Amino acid sequence: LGFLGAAGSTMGAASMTLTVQARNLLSGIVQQQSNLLRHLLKLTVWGIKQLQARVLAVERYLRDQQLLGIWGCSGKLICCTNVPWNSSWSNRNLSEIWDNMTWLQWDKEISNYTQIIYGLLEESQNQQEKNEQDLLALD
């Protein structure tokens, strides 16, 4: 275990842990609450690099976390979707990918049409599914 501890292991192992990566993603001991505590101008070059790094920290976290909210998966770490898998994406079989490719390799295998999957993802799970209440919310 550890942060990215299973980065080189098979995809089945990264499926098993996963939180250790998600936990250490927003806040860090490195930030350490700023201030010297314990000259009186904090306009130094260091303060500029820190604050612009604290911004992109939450700017990149919220850019990805906004994606989880529009897919109905905000509350959980792994959610299933109602989008069928299209064979043009990969020809490999069920146990052939989860035990032989590792995630590091997999991100390069879908990076071509990865944005296209994201487009179809907002539709089937939250554009129609959240709409389907119309008939079932009350009759």
Added chain:
Amino acid sequence: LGFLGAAGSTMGAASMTLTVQARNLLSGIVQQQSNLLRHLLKLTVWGIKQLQARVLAVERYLRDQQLLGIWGCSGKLICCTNVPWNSSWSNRNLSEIWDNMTWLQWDKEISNYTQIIYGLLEESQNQQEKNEQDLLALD
């Protein structure tokens, strides 16, 4: 379609799409990851306007997204509530508003007591509803 593509269409159409507005709300191509990449002082007037604009970006997104979390609607884009509609708000009927007013007009029709609705919203759906486990969580 498109960003605000149904801003002028009836409320029934904005109900149908809606994500295109919600998607392009936090992150933008305009931000474009800052830095020149490809004089050594980034204290320029431009860097001040950009960073203060990136802050109010997530400051306004999280101010509204915090409201969705205290209503039990964080995970989804459209959730139903257990607050009955009070007739003093509007006298119009079910199909009379969704097909004749457009949202742009509607926001002006509730802006007077809109904050009062928000107050009652935290109560019935999350102050009582999340509390109701007391009896049902375990007997």
Added chain:
Amino acid sequence: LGFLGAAGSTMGAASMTLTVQARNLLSGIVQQQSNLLRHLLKLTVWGIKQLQARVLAVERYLRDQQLLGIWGCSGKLICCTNVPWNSSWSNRNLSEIWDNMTWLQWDKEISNYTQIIYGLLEESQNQQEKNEQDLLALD
């Protein structure tokens, strides 16, 4: 009622309200949308203290809200967990704590092993529970 209105009352009362504290946690009237509106250098000492305070505002909100998301409790304000309570933490009984300690006192009673509880919290409710679909997601 009011912000922290039940800070001195019993834990059963803070259980009853609670939102008033959670609501006034991210956004404030104090921030008041900056700008003078209504000399042309905003590099003043005031602008530095404000912006660094607006950052730690959402930096502390998202650091805690990230914890609610990895526990499956993001959408709601009070969620139950599948972690059994370990007697070494407190020897007191069910009605003995909720009616005699107040939260202010309680945070000092668990602050020693509070981080250890958080570790076990990610596991039983989201490391195993979200994984349990494997057998039940489809057979």
Added chain:
Amino acid sequence: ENLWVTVYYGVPVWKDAETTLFCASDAKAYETEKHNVWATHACVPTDPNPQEIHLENVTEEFNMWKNNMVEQMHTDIISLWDQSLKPCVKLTPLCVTLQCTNVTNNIRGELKNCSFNMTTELRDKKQKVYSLFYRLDVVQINSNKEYRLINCNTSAITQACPKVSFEPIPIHYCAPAGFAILKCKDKKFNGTGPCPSVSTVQCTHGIKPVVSTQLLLNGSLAEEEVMIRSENITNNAKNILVQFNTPVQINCTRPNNNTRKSIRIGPGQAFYATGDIIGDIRQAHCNVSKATWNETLGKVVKQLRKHFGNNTIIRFANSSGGDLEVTTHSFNCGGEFFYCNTSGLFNSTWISNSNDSITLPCRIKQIINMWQRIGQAMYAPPIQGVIRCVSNITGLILTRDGGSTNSTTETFRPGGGDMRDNWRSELYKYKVVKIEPLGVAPTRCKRRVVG
């Protein structure tokens, strides 16, 4: 009993921490006269509605000497002052040999008519003009007297901006999200301790940065008889703050009719010298209602009785040692800086159980670098016209009786040695805390079995 853990978001608990606060004030200077040295060109506007909640059942402990809101206050004013002098006219050319003379002894002399040689607009040519300067701001060198500015020896000099108000206006300190400021609503609050009446206001009261020495002005006063606060009583050494219940009124005025003489020293830059005086020379003064003063000084020795050797002899002496600018009631008024002799107020002694009005002599200084800051001093231009200040005096500052090992009696003489204690007279009741909304508690409740 299968007790399960349950999470609660928004739990009212806090831990003592100190974060960065910011400014708040409504419509103040605005269009007619702006450019205040403190409020800058823009402060975040205060909400018209103040939020105060009387936290029930809570007994949080305060500490006003280990509180960091006063230290945040201190470093803010210094950085705020230096930012309001940085873009202005520097008076480096003002360091030349000065040949000065008295004024109308008529053979009474405390200012000198100075002639000196100074650069003009064109760098090539020079110009000679006169100017008046107050005593002590200039010193001799070695028939015709020869003088030099007292600051040209030490650090540099920069003129204060001509259209800048040094008037203290209320500045509000307020917390950041997830933080709250706790107010001590307990009227009697001996030093610091557990306060039974706490509030969690989001924003402090109206705090004015009254730059004062030894005696405080325009401050806050609790309703009970005068309060006495010491970090440690009996450590003769630590200074003593004093809060009144009713403030005394002291009015001060400079009768000198200064004319404005602007002489350029190069381009755009213009030195504002004291012109020629109109009217007979009159020393600056301060009025104190002798009736009102005698009782305020009495209520203190009554409160001090129960804190110093019970019934015994309490005397008041003039400052005691020190430098001329720290042992007098220094302050700013209208732009000119007064230094009044306090020996006339701390001379009486009472023990064992239309109207006359005391007056105080005051001298004026135009060269200043405050907070013992040896970095850079500033020249305050003379204020053209009439001067009159009318501010309440609400606080005090006292000091030692040397090191009298036990013995017969106790004496307390004024000594506003530091500036940060002045704001401690306004911040004794406040303290900021960090809200921690995450609380975990057990209850016999678990969510669905599989999911």
Added chain:
Amino acid sequence: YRLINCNTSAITQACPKVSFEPIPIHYCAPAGFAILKCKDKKFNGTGPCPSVS
């Protein structure tokens, strides 16, 4: 003679290698904001624009 500005304010030389040529600068909105364009060709002073983008 004398420079006309030495009478008034100070003076500072323009940098030697600085282009004063106007190049296109784009103004664009922050997240949660949008800029509305009047696509109505005839637009007397200002009023309700039927063609917005």
